[PDB]
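Bug report (template v2)

What were you trying to do?
Predict the complex of my protein with potassium ion.

What happened?
Run completed; filing so the output is reviewed.

Input:
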Amino acid sequence: GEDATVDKMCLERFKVFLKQYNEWVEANKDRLEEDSYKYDQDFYPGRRIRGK
Amino acid sequence: TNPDSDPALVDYDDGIDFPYDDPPLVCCFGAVQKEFVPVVRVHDNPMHPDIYSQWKMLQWDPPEFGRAPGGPPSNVAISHVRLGGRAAFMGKVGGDDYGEELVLMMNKERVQTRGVKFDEGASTACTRVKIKFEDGKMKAETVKEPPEDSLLASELNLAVLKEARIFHFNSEVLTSPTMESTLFKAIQWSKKFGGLIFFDLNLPLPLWRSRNETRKLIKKSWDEANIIEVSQQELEFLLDEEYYERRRNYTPQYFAEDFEQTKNRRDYYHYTPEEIKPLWHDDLKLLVVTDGTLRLHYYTPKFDGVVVGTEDVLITPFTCDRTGSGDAVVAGIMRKLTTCPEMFEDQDVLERQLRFAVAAGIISQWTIGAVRGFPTESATQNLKEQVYVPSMW
Amino acid sequence: AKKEPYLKSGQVLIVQRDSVVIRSAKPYLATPGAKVHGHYREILYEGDT
Amino acid sequence: IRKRNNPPDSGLISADSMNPFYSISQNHGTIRMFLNRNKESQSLLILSSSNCFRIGPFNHVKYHLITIKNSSGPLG
Ligand SMILES: [Ca+2]
Ligand SMILES: [K+]
């Protein structure tokens, strides 16, 4: 219940990873998407979801 | 009575009071030549340089731009008369034997040459040029234009223009400053009397150099043409040559999006009217895109579509000749337009009458020479009924 | 259904939420007593009996 | 074998045209390969857009607190 909420959790090592992960995502969201178009002609299950 | 005057004051009048004889007259304006395919592009797999007997192999396996090549406006006039219509040719020829021969060629074809002027001090189909070595490359400059490219605006036959319900010209005249000025006067007169303007592009060799440059030259004549005929290569070149080539070369990586794509047939792509918007204008009553005699993509303000055709140059391998096929399909269009005014606003009858143009083009590919083997109306009508099921004719 | 066009002959290769991908197949009717040449899943080229 | 034993060490002076990398400066389809043990050699087929096609879309799938909405994702 209430004692089991997130605010009672440490998760700091995972939180630091999320901080690094979010920073990496912003700096590579566009870069990865362009590579998908450059290499994968047609979208297929298992490929990067691109476009709309 | 002044051809060079502005077509806004008193007409040429004269004593025409009785009704004109059917079918409606058609004016074909520009140079007069025999053969002389204008559309020239660079093609791969050339045959033997000297052994011309092998060159038939490129007639039944032609370059995609030369599938139904056009010609001079004289071919359209000659082919139109053999289809039953009446055509008058406007142009200038020299006083030499060739000018007499060319006029004799059109006279024997029942083409009204009353609009043909004679330049005594000129040599027919003869352009005097000066060779100059500029930047290490040999070039030439037109010192004196030929009589074909030397028709003054004061030499126009207003009697032809008033009667002519359709005015036909090519983009070859746009390569001559003299004829380009004369053309706009003739178009202005023709619009005054109510005739329709037909623009068969047939882009000559210089006009294939650049898309932007060509569209600027065509811009003025394109905007005043009620009917325009272009080939697939011409239309793609005007819009984007590389874009439509990439679509043809595109193959889905994993699977086809429909069963028909698996067959990997020839790409008979029908351009959407949105892709035609850059080239469309208010006065354009009809635009036809001809993939040879295979597809006739027609476009009207109200509707658009494609008419499926065929080609069988292989049925007579030794007498097949693509030359003049584009003239035959154009002449077939004008033959029916002058007789079926409902075509511009009835899609069903538009397809049926365009099949006549398809059949005319097919026959024109079965004989060596353009004017030598332009089909007769009965020959064209018979092929249309044989090729198509009776529901399509 | 009524609205959907007919399905070309083949085997259902991919099933998705809305669309289905079919691998083209050509059924040959065979009467009893005929002799099928080739084991199951054997590759046949054009013109092979 | 054993590239040491390559008289091709003198083969370049013969009719060879190997670049010294000091002055030198579509087709698709998946592999459909299976082992038919009667041949002792796997046979190959190519599945491409010329064999597999897509049937048009249709509706054939018929479905039978301090918290956020359920979302497909990792649990850890
Ligand atoms: Ca043409
Ligand atoms: K011909």
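What did the reviewer find?
The interface with chain B takes residues 8, 13-14, 21, 24 of chain C (CB under 8 Å). The pocket of potassium ion (ligand 2) is lined by residues B 321, 323-324, 364, 367, 369-370, 373 (CB under 6 Å).
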